[PDB]
Amino acid sequence: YQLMCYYTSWAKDRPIEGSFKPGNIDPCLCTHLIYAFAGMQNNEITYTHEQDLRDYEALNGLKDKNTELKTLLAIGGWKFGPAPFSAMVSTPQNRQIFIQSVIRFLRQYNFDGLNLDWQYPGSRGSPPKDKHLFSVLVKEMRKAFEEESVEKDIPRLLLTSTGAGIIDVIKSGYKIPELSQSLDYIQVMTYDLHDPKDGYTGENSPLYKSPYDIGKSADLNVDSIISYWKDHGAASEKLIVGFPAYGHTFILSDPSKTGIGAPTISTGPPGKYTDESGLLAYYEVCTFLNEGATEVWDAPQEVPYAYQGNEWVGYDNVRSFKLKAQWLKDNNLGGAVVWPLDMDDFSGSFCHQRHFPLTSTLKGDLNIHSASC
């Protein structure tokens, strides 16, 4: 199995206590490290901030400590949006410019591959034709990577892409059989499945549906999402399940109604370190628990939730990661990806479960152990 781990560039800018630098990642913890976000300029991949170059150096330097470790550079993300991608895939000229820039960039900075994270071909403004054009881009990129590998007699660069977790988004943006032919891995975004804008409490990454889920909501769970991808042609071994190292917060309409599906008013207040209304890093959830929140296990979905006064949080803990890891193995999947590693309790200071409690759980349960480690 693979255990991929995202490192986000902005994690180092948080208050020192929550600040995380790529060079401080345990080199033996994961099989792949993914640097979250390269930018794009004139249809070419590039850095988002010039200081990112130092990050690349530190991140890839970890490979001297774990010779089997691979690194990937991700481009895109939710905030980036679809527009730059729509323009880049619109013509053969633009795609060639992009593909060649990727090979040059990854080889220059010692990355082993690319992680395409177009948040969404076919939706959010991206026209229907982008479902086909995204597939064309992926096929052309894979071909170029194969050709470069043969010409230089070195291992081929890896090509991966995120895959939506929302069914309607999968339908409008992904030619699954074609994409599965050309991609090495598909990182399925099995997270952010329920959020405050729903009007009721809901889990971030439930394994199974809640008995309260109705209609399309009954598909907002890991099992249903992965089943959809497989039923539509994705190679099971290429599917990498998303494991969130954070939860979502809600303000309860009634502090007496605290279960799944309870009415809510809005997102909860931002955490001290992550500063994002509606979200808390796993380490911030540990603080919430330590300071008195009532913790409950939701067996139907096999994930925890906690509440204090009118604040409710749906998240993932060691037990939910363990159960999902077993399920992943039972379903012959390719592995897991922790999103984002910088929100796990990397210092061990917040949860008292040692360093990287969530990710370490997956390392053990997925039998991750490289020869040089």
PDB file of C-alpha atoms in Angstrom, residues 39-147:
ATOM      1  CA  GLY A  39       1.341  27.928  -9.476  1.00  0.00           C
ATOM      2  CA  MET A  40       0.905  28.585 -13.188  1.00  0.00           C
ATOM      3  CA  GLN A  41       2.020  31.481 -15.384  1.00  0.00           C
ATOM      4  CA  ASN A  42       1.777  31.735 -19.176  1.00  0.00           C
ATOM      5  CA  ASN A  43       0.590  28.100 -19.260  1.00  0.00           C
ATOM      6  CA  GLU A  44       3.717  26.911 -17.442  1.00  0.00           C
ATOM      7  CA  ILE A  45       4.012  25.426 -13.969  1.00  0.00           C
ATOM      8  CA  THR A  46       5.975  27.618 -11.562  1.00  0.00           C
ATOM      9  CA  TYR A  47       6.200  28.392  -7.849  1.00  0.00           C
ATOM     10  CA  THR A  48       3.464  30.268  -5.962  1.00  0.00           C
ATOM     11  CA  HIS A  49       6.000  32.141  -3.824  1.00  0.00           C
ATOM     12  CA  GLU A  50       9.739  32.384  -4.436  1.00  0.00           C
ATOM     13  CA  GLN A  51      10.499  31.102  -0.932  1.00  0.00           C
ATOM     14  CA  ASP A  52       8.837  27.858  -2.041  1.00  0.00           C
ATOM     15  CA  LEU A  53      12.128  26.941  -3.684  1.00  0.00           C
ATOM     16  CA  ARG A  54      13.727  26.548  -0.239  1.00  0.00           C
ATOM     17  CA  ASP A  55      10.778  24.359   0.755  1.00  0.00           C
ATOM     18  CA  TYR A  56      11.315  22.136  -2.274  1.00  0.00           C
ATOM     19  CA  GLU A  57      14.960  21.730  -1.290  1.00  0.00           C
ATOM     20  CA  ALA A  58      14.111  20.807   2.298  1.00  0.00           C
ATOM     21  CA  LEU A  59      11.296  18.479   1.288  1.00  0.00           C
ATOM     22  CA  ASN A  60      13.254  16.603  -1.342  1.00  0.00           C
ATOM     23  CA  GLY A  61      16.297  16.484   0.911  1.00  0.00           C
ATOM     24  CA  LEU A  62      14.302  14.069   3.073  1.00  0.00           C
ATOM     25  CA  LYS A  63      14.900  11.500   0.332  1.00  0.00           C
ATOM     26  CA  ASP A  64      18.521  11.276   1.490  1.00  0.00           C
ATOM     27  CA  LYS A  65      17.110   9.900   4.758  1.00  0.00           C
ATOM     28  CA  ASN A  66      14.616   7.532   3.108  1.00  0.00           C
ATOM     29  CA  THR A  67      15.873   6.448  -0.309  1.00  0.00           C
ATOM     30  CA  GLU A  68      12.538   4.856  -1.211  1.00  0.00           C
ATOM     31  CA  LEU A  69      10.566   8.038  -0.473  1.00  0.00           C
ATOM     32  CA  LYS A  70       8.994   9.798  -3.459  1.00  0.00           C
ATOM     33  CA  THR A  71       7.910  13.418  -3.725  1.00  0.00           C
ATOM     34  CA  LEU A  72       5.183  14.945  -5.857  1.00  0.00           C
ATOM     35  CA  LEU A  73       4.369  18.549  -6.695  1.00  0.00           C
ATOM     36  CA  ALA A  74       0.651  19.409  -6.670  1.00  0.00           C
ATOM     37  CA  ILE A  75      -0.870  22.141  -8.819  1.00  0.00           C
ATOM     38  CA  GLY A  76      -4.364  23.539  -8.350  1.00  0.00           C
ATOM     39  CA  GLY A  77      -6.602  23.190  -5.338  1.00  0.00           C
ATOM     40  CA  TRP A  78      -9.949  24.686  -4.378  1.00  0.00           C
ATOM     41  CA  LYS A  79      -8.850  28.322  -4.161  1.00  0.00           C
ATOM     42  CA  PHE A  80      -6.922  28.189  -7.432  1.00  0.00           C
ATOM     43  CA  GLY A  81     -10.092  27.175  -9.210  1.00  0.00           C
ATOM     44  CA  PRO A  82     -10.713  25.900 -12.749  1.00  0.00           C
ATOM     45  CA  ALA A  83      -9.965  28.896 -14.920  1.00  0.00           C
ATOM     46  CA  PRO A  84      -6.180  28.563 -15.397  1.00  0.00           C
ATOM     47  CA  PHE A  85      -6.659  24.887 -16.273  1.00  0.00           C
ATOM     48  CA  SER A  86      -9.489  25.586 -18.735  1.00  0.00           C
ATOM     49  CA  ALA A  87      -7.274  28.025 -20.617  1.00  0.00           C
ATOM     50  CA  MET A  88      -4.245  25.710 -20.554  1.00  0.00           C
ATOM     51  CA  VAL A  89      -6.018  22.646 -21.984  1.00  0.00           C
ATOM     52  CA  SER A  90      -7.880  24.643 -24.639  1.00  0.00           C
ATOM     53  CA  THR A  91      -5.259  24.173 -27.355  1.00  0.00           C
ATOM     54  CA  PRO A  92      -2.541  21.679 -28.276  1.00  0.00           C
ATOM     55  CA  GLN A  93      -0.002  24.535 -28.102  1.00  0.00           C
ATOM     56  CA  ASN A  94      -0.956  25.438 -24.535  1.00  0.00           C
ATOM     57  CA  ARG A  95      -0.913  21.811 -23.371  1.00  0.00           C
ATOM     58  CA  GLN A  96       2.530  21.233 -24.888  1.00  0.00           C
ATOM     59  CA  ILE A  97       3.869  24.375 -23.227  1.00  0.00           C
ATOM     60  CA  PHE A  98       2.515  23.142 -19.897  1.00  0.00           C
ATOM     61  CA  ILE A  99       3.729  19.546 -20.258  1.00  0.00           C
ATOM     62  CA  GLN A 100       7.240  20.575 -21.225  1.00  0.00           C
ATOM     63  CA  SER A 101       7.407  23.080 -18.374  1.00  0.00           C
ATOM     64  CA  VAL A 102       6.383  20.325 -15.958  1.00  0.00           C
ATOM     65  CA  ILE A 103       9.150  17.957 -17.026  1.00  0.00           C
ATOM     66  CA  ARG A 104      11.739  20.751 -16.735  1.00  0.00           C
ATOM     67  CA  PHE A 105      10.434  21.960 -13.371  1.00  0.00           C
ATOM     68  CA  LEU A 106      10.127  18.566 -11.697  1.00  0.00           C
ATOM     69  CA  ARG A 107      13.570  17.428 -12.850  1.00  0.00           C
ATOM     70  CA  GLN A 108      15.212  20.754 -11.870  1.00  0.00           C
ATOM     71  CA  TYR A 109      13.829  20.591  -8.335  1.00  0.00           C
ATOM     72  CA  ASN A 110      14.135  16.846  -7.751  1.00  0.00           C
ATOM     73  CA  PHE A 111      10.451  15.893  -7.658  1.00  0.00           C
ATOM     74  CA  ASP A 112       9.428  12.366  -8.640  1.00  0.00           C
ATOM     75  CA  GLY A 113       6.119  13.354 -10.182  1.00  0.00           C
ATOM     76  CA  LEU A 114       3.105  15.627 -10.526  1.00  0.00           C
ATOM     77  CA  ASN A 115      -0.243  15.770  -8.717  1.00  0.00           C
ATOM     78  CA  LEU A 116      -2.909  17.454 -10.843  1.00  0.00           C
ATOM     79  CA  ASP A 117      -5.557  18.984  -8.573  1.00  0.00           C
ATOM     80  CA  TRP A 118      -7.939  20.796 -10.926  1.00  0.00           C
ATOM     81  CA  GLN A 119     -10.885  21.655  -8.793  1.00  0.00           C
ATOM     82  CA  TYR A 120     -12.939  20.680 -11.327  1.00  0.00           C
ATOM     83  CA  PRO A 121     -13.038  20.070 -15.005  1.00  0.00           C
ATOM     84  CA  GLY A 122     -16.709  20.388 -15.948  1.00  0.00           C
ATOM     85  CA  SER A 123     -17.964  22.457 -12.997  1.00  0.00           C
ATOM     86  CA  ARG A 124     -17.342  25.721 -11.103  1.00  0.00           C
ATOM     87  CA  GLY A 125     -17.326  27.500 -14.450  1.00  0.00           C
ATOM     88  CA  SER A 126     -15.293  24.954 -16.384  1.00  0.00           C
ATOM     89  CA  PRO A 127     -17.341  23.990 -19.479  1.00  0.00           C
ATOM     90  CA  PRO A 128     -18.473  20.442 -20.369  1.00  0.00           C
ATOM     91  CA  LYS A 129     -15.763  20.117 -23.023  1.00  0.00           C
ATOM     92  CA  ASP A 130     -13.147  20.162 -20.253  1.00  0.00           C
ATOM     93  CA  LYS A 131     -14.092  16.619 -19.221  1.00  0.00           C
ATOM     94  CA  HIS A 132     -12.702  15.470 -22.566  1.00  0.00           C
ATOM     95  CA  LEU A 133      -9.830  17.974 -22.637  1.00  0.00           C
ATOM     96  CA  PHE A 134      -8.687  17.010 -19.132  1.00  0.00           C
ATOM     97  CA  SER A 135      -8.500  13.398 -20.309  1.00  0.00           C
ATOM     98  CA  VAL A 136      -6.513  14.490 -23.395  1.00  0.00           C
ATOM     99  CA  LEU A 137      -4.101  16.464 -21.180  1.00  0.00           C
ATOM    100  CA  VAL A 138      -3.559  13.468 -18.903  1.00  0.00           C
ATOM    101  CA  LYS A 139      -2.945  11.099 -21.813  1.00  0.00           C
ATOM    102  CA  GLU A 140      -0.484  13.515 -23.447  1.00  0.00           C
ATOM    103  CA  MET A 141       1.306  14.126 -20.140  1.00  0.00           C
ATOM    104  CA  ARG A 142       1.682  10.389 -19.524  1.00  0.00           C
ATOM    105  CA  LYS A 143       3.063   9.909 -23.045  1.00  0.00           C
ATOM    106  CA  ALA A 144       5.565  12.743 -22.601  1.00  0.00           C
ATOM    107  CA  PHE A 145       6.671  11.307 -19.244  1.00  0.00           C
ATOM    108  CA  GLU A 146       7.158   7.879 -20.856  1.00  0.00           C
ATOM    109  CA  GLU A 147       9.199   9.365 -23.700  1.00  0.00           C
TER     110      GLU A 147
END
